[PDB]
């Protein structure tokens, strides 16, 4: 049973690494620019954002950023002009674009918590 104990120790360490990785994945907000695959990550005001630039591989996402040049029922749409929809005429001059994405994602979180309690 010495070999069995060695294998059990191997299992224990892997489980600990996976637990750390899960702790780090729960606090990530996944968004998709839907206007090879590209990935970007950045933190803004203590909130990490994980955007992918490209139908069932993407299912557990928070919002779908979708730019317009002047599982969808359960995902909000941040409509940029270069379930509730949020629209903001783009303004590359300032960093308001990022502030909008933050204010929208923060409201999707608050409204999903006002439905679990059963108050909406």
């Amino acid at each position: 049973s010495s070999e069995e104990k060695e294998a059990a120790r191997r299992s224990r360490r892997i489980d600990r690494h996976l637990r750390s990785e899960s702790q780090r994945q729960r606090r990530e907000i996944k968004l998709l620019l839907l206007g090879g695959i590209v990935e970007n990550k950045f933190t803004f005001k203590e909130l990490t954002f994980k955007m992918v630039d490209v139908i069932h591989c993407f299912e557990g996402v928070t919002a779908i950023i979708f730019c317009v040049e002047l599982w969808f029922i359960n995902t909000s749409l941040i409509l940029f002009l270069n379930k509730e929809i949020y629209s903001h005429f783009t303004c590359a001059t300032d960093t308001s674009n990022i502030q909008f994405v933050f204010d929208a994602v923060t409201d999707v979180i608050i409204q999903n918590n006002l439905k679990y309690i059963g108050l909406c």
């Binding site: 069995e4 294998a7 059990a8 191997r10 299992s11 892997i14 489980d15 690494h17 996976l18 990785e21 899960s22 994945q25 090879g36 695959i37 591989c57 299912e59 557990g60």
Partner: protein, 321 residues
């Protein structure tokens, strides 16, 4: 093409169902979850069995390719994956290699006895399925309507199997490892020989895209699952459809189909969070493997036929025996 249309009715004589009217039913098969493999933090899209019928490998969306010892429920190895987008996994006949792949258009081979020993590039679409032909050759099927055999030594497409008009999403290698059959979006499945890139045969019976396929253990037949909420058992030698496995209570697509060791029982996974067992000779539901919280994505039968393992989107593998 005129000859093809005529030959089918000419050789279609007595329905296989008519021939099987004499065979006695299998009764009722009740399978019970023996073990529960847990540790994936996200949806599991694929799982492959080792030829030893003991070790297996699973691929999930948390960039994780985990090797598990099914008997002792122990994580042997946890291999992190560059892409978090992963649709396929495999496990070499030898036991010294696994292979994954996904949205990234690269098939990533890992040497077991863990670091990427080779990356295979060239496909212009998501890898849907891959199967180790031997210790040195691999067959892959991609979302740009092209299948390919790869030499690992150099790292190039040796041949390229083209002709499908839709995204090839399922791939089955024959027991003799001489031929392979591919199922794609065009509701058609094509037989190909690895020797020459010449489509040996084409079968058109389904109504929707084909998501699963698996050879019969004899190697002369195959079964195909589609989004048409039906499965179909074709025959290589007969070059046509013989039986259809569909039930009205089922309207969702099939994600995975597998045969028993003798090929009598046809396990099939569905989107109703259930797995229906069918009589491959009688088109009769021999049982149900209910118990998965999310959709059953991939299903496997051990080489010795001892047990069947089901992976699912609920981040849990279930061994049933």
């Amino acid at each position: 093409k005129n000859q093809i249309r005529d030959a089918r009715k000419a050789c279609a004589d007595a329905t296989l169902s008519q021939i099987t009217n004499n065979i006695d039913p299998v009764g009722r098969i009740q399978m019970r979850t023996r073990r529960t493999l847990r540790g994936h933090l996200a949806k599991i899209y694929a799982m492959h069995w080792g030829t030893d019928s003991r070790l297996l490998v699973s691929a999930s969306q948390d960039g994780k390719l985990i090797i598990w010892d099914s008997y002792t429920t122990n994580k042997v190895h946890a291999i992190p994956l560059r892409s978090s987008w992963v649709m396929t996994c495999a496990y070499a006949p030898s036991g010294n290699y696994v292979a994954c792949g996904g949205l990234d258009n690269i098939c990533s081979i890992y040497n077991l006895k863990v670091r990427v020993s080779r990356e295979l590039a060239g496909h212009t679409g998501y890898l849907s399925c891959c199967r180790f032909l031997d210790d040195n050759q691999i067959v892959t099927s991609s979302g740009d309507t092209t299948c390919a055999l790869w030499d690992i030594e150099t790292g190039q497409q040796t041949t390229t199997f083209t002709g499908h008009t839709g995204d090839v999403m399922s791939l089955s290698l024959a027991p003799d490892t001489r031929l392979f059959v591919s199922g794609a979006c065009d509701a058609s499945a094509k037989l190909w020989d690895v020797r020459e890139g010449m489509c040996r045969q084409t079968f058109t019976g389904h109504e929707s895209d084909i998501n699963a396929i698996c050879f019969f253990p004899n190697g002369n037949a195959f079964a195909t699952g589609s989004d048409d909420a039906t499965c179909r058992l074709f025959d290589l030698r007969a070059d046509q459809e013989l039986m259809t496995y569909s039930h009205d209570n089922i309207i969702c697509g099939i994600t995975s189909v597998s045969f028993s060791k003798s090929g009598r029982l046809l396990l099939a996974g569905y989107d109703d969070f259930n797995c229906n067992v069918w009589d491959a000779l009688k088109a009769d539901r021999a049982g149900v493997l209910a118990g998965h919280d999310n959709r059953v994505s991939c299903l496997g039968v051990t080489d010795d036929g001892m047990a069947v393992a089901t992976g699912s989107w609920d981040s849990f593998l279930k061994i049933w025996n």
